């Protein structure tokens, strides 16, 4: 479209903001119809969901801002709600709009995902301050509601907190995005579409989880077992672990997933078959307590010291492991279940051992703006590994679902190839284009 | 006007959206053209400055609300406001304005002052969710930036946080006052609007410098000290220290004052001459010394520790106390320095015995609605002590700018007659009228 | 012995010295060679395995305290150790002693239980400091090494904290109790023997657990969802979410301990039958969820608001329904799992609510004397509820083993009678002795 | 003596049992009667008021562990101290002493200074765990009162908290120290004994203020303005803030100090001279926020932003700055008083911003483990300039008096020569001697 081509050709705020916008727009999505289309099936193959095609451009809200779309990446969350799993995205749409006004655009027969992404604003609703036409931006997936009084408290804490492209509807797997102003950063200059891109969700979750007083906050000395370690969060985990001056113990279950976690500097790495942890163990208490013994003094031996932080979020059939293996008034935090949410661990070793479990979820406009802040100054680079275009989405959906990625699948959306964006490329050159992209081409295959 | 008609006649919400708004409202402001009238003027009568008049309505941005006022308060910044101190305000609403966009409404000739308010929603803007015209409500000051990741951490401290009334325009002292959605709270059913309208800023203040994990935090059995506890701050300070099973100690001026706080059951009084503090003591690290060790010594005596945490507002006169009275470990929580901001301390006091300092202003959102939770179930009173006509609102901040309140003067605004806009008359009768209003009918002289 | 004597006449602290100690003295306590009596057992009978009778007086270590025990309380680690379960706490006693030095002690053939007390200073070591002879004193349970560094952040946190009479021996369930001074607090002068004793162990866990910024650290208008309310853990929450100006909503399982809940104040109050319950809802995810919801919604009808805190300690049964209760940002606190310690719960609450699991246990040598100090301004009051002499202490063991009680059952030990050991009368008198004791009687 | 010659040699732990305890130590102190001696003297020169000879050996407590010094450090409460400013510490150790009991031995006419060391564990007391004679130690300088509840909160907040060789005598500028174990670690084993010494008290204190949370608690990104940054303090907080992936910015007051942190890696740096900082700048209320907004500039141009946290302790010339340019929310901490303890600032900036000052003092024994352990790893480094034998402490403490020091100054007290104690050379090998030593020779 004109619109397209003018901020694909870098034209101007007031060029970008002349050309007229889409009455529709390409869009990775779901169809409300499919939700029950993996109903007993094993492998519920995102690729079988998943639809790449025009969308209608929905009306912008006054606090909103749409973003043309360069590249996003995939998540998680993408995964899951290309499986409609645990529950189908289409419900929380529809909870989405219950809340009535602007909401009710989110109930749509199409659920367009994508939880982060970078691009460039092309409109802003009439209450949006400063973004401009123009601006390159990273949206991060914290979609809250400024009105409630928890906002103001935490942003991740409202009742009406949502995750972009999850529980609404206009995410970033698309040309185009729809997004609050509050899900807005600039974009770091030095990076390209798809590297800032791949950031937001993971990074942000990780840093509170991690970093930010809402989560661990973890101190420079901290050990931190993180499980899990070669995929999006833990390689941002071990990024903010190592930048923290912490000790990052990774948890990984291949020699490439090592690797990975080795390429982002964490050279303490735990397989997870040198401790034979199979997902049975989650219902063997006592082989949980041998294992977590083991785990531990594993931890010990790599690091010095059982783990101040557990970085949870493969859920339980590590759990037991996480609450065991914690140090005495240590901390898991869990973001996540992917191997199953319902834990099971061992209490005593909870209150005897004065152990937390810090429950935690994406990441509210702050901490995305310190999490931003990292990335800004090269301290954390992003830990893409794989660039898919859009029209590929669906594959780079499975990569991630059948875990044969390292770090993050990054999705180019409008951007017509790889290595756009960068704006400031002085920096990007000083800090090293291999040091951003250490994970470069690394798969778990 | 049909609007205010409406509004006081307890019109539907459709009734009240088909009442027009008013091209002008009664305003207590000031006139831009008399920031400099107080120079070299000793006693700085904020009746000479004070104006009521009518005022432009401003256009509604999209995450306004326009509320029908119908009681606001006397708060302290709106006698700084009248006296233009320590900076006139309307340098304020300047900066506010260099913002743009919707912010340029704030710079005006006049300045419409009142940082909280009880009233009635009669319009909002497009991004407004839930509030809708006819809903009670009490607005608090905290006027922020939700598009700052800062505001996500805390509503209180984003750059662009600004006090209703001071740093903006539209404040409360009015018929209608032009609020963000995020200052609204739904007012207690039980009060009347003068009740209501009394507490926002101070409680919400008194609640973050007290309650909240954002100020000292006090928790049951903290001795708290509370210095000008028979004013507004304090009035609410002592409710949160008894309601969180703290020990106020009230420092009070005044025989009268005493009599204030022991109505609200501070019976643990400190007459600070019963001190000899004067206000040169400031400038007398020795005696502030020997006094502060008397303070802390009279504390003991009534309270049975050192104060854990001093509540402050009084300024430079009482900081170099405040820093040697707090327990070692202890939190001297300031807002405000009515006697004069260059605070001077030893700092010895602050860190051989671990104290901390912690600056706190307004409160915010959440904040706000936890003070309003307790006010709800009546757990924390209004601490209104007088009520002025809209018509006397000049001489109410008179009364206010000369210590001759305690608690909290009410300015009755769009509402008629006192004791209006109890919609939950039997919790008001269950809490009972006097508990509601401790203070009633007493003064400081 | 003379020594006894001295104390209960009251004796100066020089006559008080110059009573000998006694080589033995009267102790509540267990055998190891009954450790195995339990095998196959399906009734622990814990009056089976509690002796009472001399056992020897160890020497004091310089930074302990020989307490010449006046009243002592079961506590639930007092049945699980009178039970050998799960683990002989002779296996904790021998752990103990691999410390060396003083803490061979420790290691014996008898173990004498007891883990909270009220008592009088009758020989310090001499590495303690400001305590003497007379002195009266309660002891709490957290013993704990302070040359931890972890110790100076937190007494709690040390690898050596040990529950007293439970991971240590001498505890209080005797005539007298040897502690570590940091176990030591002025006893609340206004209080009896017995109504001091019941409180050091349960009162400061529930502290740490609720009010202080070890645990929870609830806030005024905190909605405070209170597991097992009646027992003793649960009559102390009441009382510190009520007293910070929280709304305790407590979970009872019949009438009887409603009736008791209500007498702290609890005004609030669910019952668990009233919900449906049993050791199966754990096991079954589906009915966690709904059930959670329904106590959810109760609470928001009996609150106004989901729990802000969650205060268990019941465990496996209630886990999984205090994490689905909890607000987003909610907090469960736990120091326990009576039903079950494999906790089973749906992550997905937590995580994504931003919940927090917050695992406590005892409370450190500060948060006891805030606890304390809360008991000396008559805030918070006792929760006993029973009073057995040391004679019955079985008895009173069994009542606590067979969940007879509500609040705490205190043990007297050197104490002869009730009522005694009261040296602020005129407080006692202003605060009210029904108001001191609003437990008495009670039972479930 | 044949104990010293003993602890040179490496002897085992018998064999420093079985070598008796001399009834006198070399030892810098102070003599009681000179207290007055500075009245009227502008220049308090620390070399006429420090003595270094014989002082009786007190008997170590039952806590307490006798020292083997090998090497202590000039702190900045030695200069203070030998100035006997503000107060002589005199006046601290009969106050230290009113305790009564083992506290008694602290009031002599003689005072030991020394507030860290390290060396060789020689004697224990009969309650202490797990040191045994001929354990490389150091010694930080909280002593701290166990048994009182606050310790166990934390060890810095007790009544009874003071400061080695400050409020206490039997400090570390001598042969043989006494401390309480509650003030050992084990020494860096990498480590020479001269290395191991300058860090406790300065580090520990950096680490407090900064690192724990305890201080300000900084997290990575950070921006922490450090002023006096090339000292002991600044020294240490420069790298606890890179090593926090924190982003110091070191004020120094000329090219030498600014050549100091650069070498510690501290890239961003403010000259404090071309601010014009004067000791009336504080009294002058718009210079001071003129003054602040153009470091609050410097700043903002330098590292990005604002500081969040300001590290504190240049006193009143620096601190109504350290109120202007701590960003919106952040934290000035400050655990001293330099240039004067009269602070004064304009609260405006503080509470309009929601700015908090926190005092802090020290570091617990938790956060001088956590400090120790980062010097085990090597993730910070001794801070060490310049080493003077004992014999030569009075003019090291001249030289801190007259701030012709960059980081610490170490001071060998037995070790009979630099480059001792050094157990795991590998470790020290992988680290680098240069890398060990970033200041070593540099000056201000
Ligand atoms: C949600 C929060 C609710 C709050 C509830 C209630 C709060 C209270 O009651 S607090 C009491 C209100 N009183 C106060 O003193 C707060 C007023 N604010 C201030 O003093 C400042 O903004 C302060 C100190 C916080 C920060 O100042 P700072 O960031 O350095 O700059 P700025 O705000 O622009 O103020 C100084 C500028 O004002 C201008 N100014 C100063 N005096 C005057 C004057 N007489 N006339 C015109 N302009 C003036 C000048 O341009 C000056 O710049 P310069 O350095 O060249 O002289
Ligand atoms: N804000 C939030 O709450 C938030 C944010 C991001 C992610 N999450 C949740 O956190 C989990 C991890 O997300 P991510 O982006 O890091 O995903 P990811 O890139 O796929 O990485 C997950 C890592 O966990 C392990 N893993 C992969 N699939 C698994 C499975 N099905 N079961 C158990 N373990 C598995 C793998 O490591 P090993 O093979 O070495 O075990 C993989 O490297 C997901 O469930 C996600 O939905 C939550
Ligand atoms: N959010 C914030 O930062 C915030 C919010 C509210 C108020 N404040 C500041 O807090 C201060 C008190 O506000 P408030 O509403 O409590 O005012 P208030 O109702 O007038 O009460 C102030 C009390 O302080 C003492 N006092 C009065 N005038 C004083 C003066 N000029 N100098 C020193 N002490 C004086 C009086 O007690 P005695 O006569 O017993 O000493 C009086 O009771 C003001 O400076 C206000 O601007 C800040
Ligand atoms: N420092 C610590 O970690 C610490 C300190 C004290 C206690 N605790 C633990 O906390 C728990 C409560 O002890 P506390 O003295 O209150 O004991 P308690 O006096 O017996 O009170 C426990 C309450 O929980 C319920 N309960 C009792 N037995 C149960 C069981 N087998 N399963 C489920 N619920 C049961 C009962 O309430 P209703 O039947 O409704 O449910 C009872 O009133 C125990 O696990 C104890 O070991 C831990
Ligand atoms: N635990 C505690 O409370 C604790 C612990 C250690 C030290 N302290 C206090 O912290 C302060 C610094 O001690 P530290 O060993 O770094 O001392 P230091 O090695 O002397 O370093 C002090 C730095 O502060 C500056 N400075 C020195 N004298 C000053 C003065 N009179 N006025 C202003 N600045 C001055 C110098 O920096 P230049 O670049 O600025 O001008 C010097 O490099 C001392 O007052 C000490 O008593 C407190």
Same mark, same amino acid.
């Given at each position: 479209?004109?619109?397209? =081509?003018? #901020?694909?050709?870098?034209?101007?705020?007031?060029?970008?903001?002349?050309?007229?916008?889409?009455?529709?727009?390409?869009?990775?999505?779901?169809?409300?119809?499919?939700?029950?289309?993996?109903?007993?099936?094993?492998?519920?193959?995102?690729?079988?969901?998943?639809?790449?095609?025009?969308?209608?451009?929905?009306?912008?809200?006054?606090?909103?801002?749409? #973003?043309?779309?360069?590249?996003?990446?995939?998540?998680?969350?993408?995964?899951?709600?290309?499986?409609?799993?645990?529950?189908?995205?289409? &419900?929380?749409?529809?909870?989405?709009?219950?809340?009535?006004?602007?909401?009710?655009?989110?109930?749509?027969?199409? &659920?367009?995902?994508?939880?982060? *992404?970078?691009?460039?604003?092309?409109?802003?609703?009439?209450?949006?301050? =400063?973004?401009?036409?123009?601006?390159?931006?990273?949206? &991060?997936?914290?979609? @809250?509601?400024?009105?409630?009084?928890?906002?103001?408290?935490?942003?991740?804490?409202?009742?009406?907190?949502?995750?972009?492209?999850?529980?609404?509807?206009?995410?970033?797997?698309?040309?185009?995005?729809?997004?609050?102003?509050?899900?807005?950063?600039?974009?770091?200059?030095?990076?390209?579409?798809?590297?800032?891109?791949?950031?937001?969700? *993971?990074?942000?979750?990780?840093?509170?989880?991690?970093?930010?007083? =809402?989560?661990?906050?973890?101190?420079?000395?901290?050990?931190?077992?993180?499980?899990?370690?070669?995929?999006?969060?833990?390689?941002?985990?071990?990024? %903010?672990?190592?930048?923290?001056?912490?000790?990052?113990?990774? @948890?990984?279950?291949?020699?490439?997933?090592?690797?990975? @976690?080795?390429?982002?500097? *964490?050279?303490?790495?735990?397989?997870?078959?040198?401790?034979?942890?199979?997902?049975?163990?989650?219902?063997?208490?006592?082989?949980?307590?041998?294992?977590?013994?083991?785990?531990?003094?594993?931890?010990?031996?790599?690091?010095?010291?059982?783990?101040?932080?557990? %970085?949870?979020?493969?859920?339980?059939?590590?759990?037991?492991?996480?609450?065991?293996?914690? =140090?005495?008034?240590?901390?898991?935090?869990? /973001?996540?279940?992917?191997?199953?949410?319902?834990?099971?661990?061992?209490?005593?070793?909870?209150?005897?051992?004065?152990?937390?479990?810090?429950?935690?979820?994406?990441?509210? &406009?702050?901490?995305?703006?310190?999490?931003?802040?990292?990335?800004?100054?090269?301290?954390?680079?992003?830990?893409?590994?794989? @660039?898919?275009?859009?029209?590929?989405?669906?594959?780079? *959906?499975? #990569?991630?679902?059948?875990?044969?990625?390292?770090?993050?699948?990054?999705?180019? /959306?409008?951007?017509?190839?790889?290595?756009?964006?960068?704006?400031?490329?002085?920096?990007?050159?000083?800090?090293?284009?291999?040091?951003?992209?250490?994970?470069?081409?690394?798969?778990?295959?």
């Amino acid at each position: 479209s004109s619109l397209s =081509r003018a #901020v694909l050709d870098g034209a101007s705020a007031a060029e970008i903001e002349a050309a007229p916008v889409p009455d529709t727009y390409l869009a990775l999505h779901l169809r409300a119809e499919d939700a029950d289309m993996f109903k007993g099936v094993a492998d519920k193959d995102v690729r079988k969901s998943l639809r790449l095609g025009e969308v209608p451009m929905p009306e912008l809200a006054p606090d909103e801002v749409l #973003v043309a779309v360069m590249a996003s990446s995939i998540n998680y969350n993408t995964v899951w709600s290309a499986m409609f799993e645990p529950i189908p995205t289409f &419900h929380f749409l529809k909870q989405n709009a219950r809340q009535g006004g602007w909401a009710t655009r989110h109930d749509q027969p199409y &659920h367009v995902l994508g939880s982060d *992404c970078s691009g460039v604003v092309v409109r802003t609703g009439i209450g949006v301050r =400063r973004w401009k036409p123009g601006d390159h931006v990273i949206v &991060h997936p914290a979609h @809250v509601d400024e009105q409630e009084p928890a906002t103001h408290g935490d942003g991740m804490l409202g009742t009406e907190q949502r995750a972009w492209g999850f529980e609404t509807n206009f995410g970033g797997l698309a040309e185009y995005g729809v997004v609050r102003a509050s899900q807005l950063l600039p974009k770091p200059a030095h990076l390209t579409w798809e590297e800032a891109a791949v950031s937001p969700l *993971c990074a942000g979750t990780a840093y509170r989880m991690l970093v930010s007083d =809402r989560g661990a906050q973890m101190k420079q000395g901290d050990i931190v077992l993180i499980w899990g370690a070669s995929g999006g969060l833990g390689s941002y985990a071990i990024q %903010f672990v190592k930048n923290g001056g912490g000790i990052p113990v990774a @948890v990984v279950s291949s020699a490439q997933k090592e690797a990975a @976690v080795r390429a982002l500097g *964490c050279d303490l790495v735990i397989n997870r078959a040198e401790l034979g942890i199979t997902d049975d163990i989650a219902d063997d208490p006592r082989r949980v307590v041998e294992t977590g013994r083991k785990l531990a003094k594993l931890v010990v031996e790599k690091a010095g010291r059982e783990p101040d932080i557990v %970085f949870e979020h493969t859920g339980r059939v590590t759990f037991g492991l996480s609450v065991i293996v914690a =140090r005495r008034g240590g901390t898991v935090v869990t /973001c996540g279940s992917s191997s199953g949410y319902l834990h099971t661990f061992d209490n005593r070793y909870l209150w005897m051992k004065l152990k937390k479990i810090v429950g935690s979820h994406g990441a509210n &406009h702050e901490e995305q703006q310190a999490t931003n802040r990292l990335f800004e100054s090269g301290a954390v680079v992003p830990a893409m590994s794989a @660039v898919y275009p859009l029209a590929e989405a669906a594959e780079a *959906c499975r #990569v991630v679902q059948t875990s044969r990625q390292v770090g993050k699948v990054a999705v180019l /959306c409008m951007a017509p190839e790889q290595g756009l964006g960068v704006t400031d490329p002085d920096l990007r050159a000083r800090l090293g284009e291999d040091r951003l992209n250490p994970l470069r081409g690394l798969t778990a295959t």
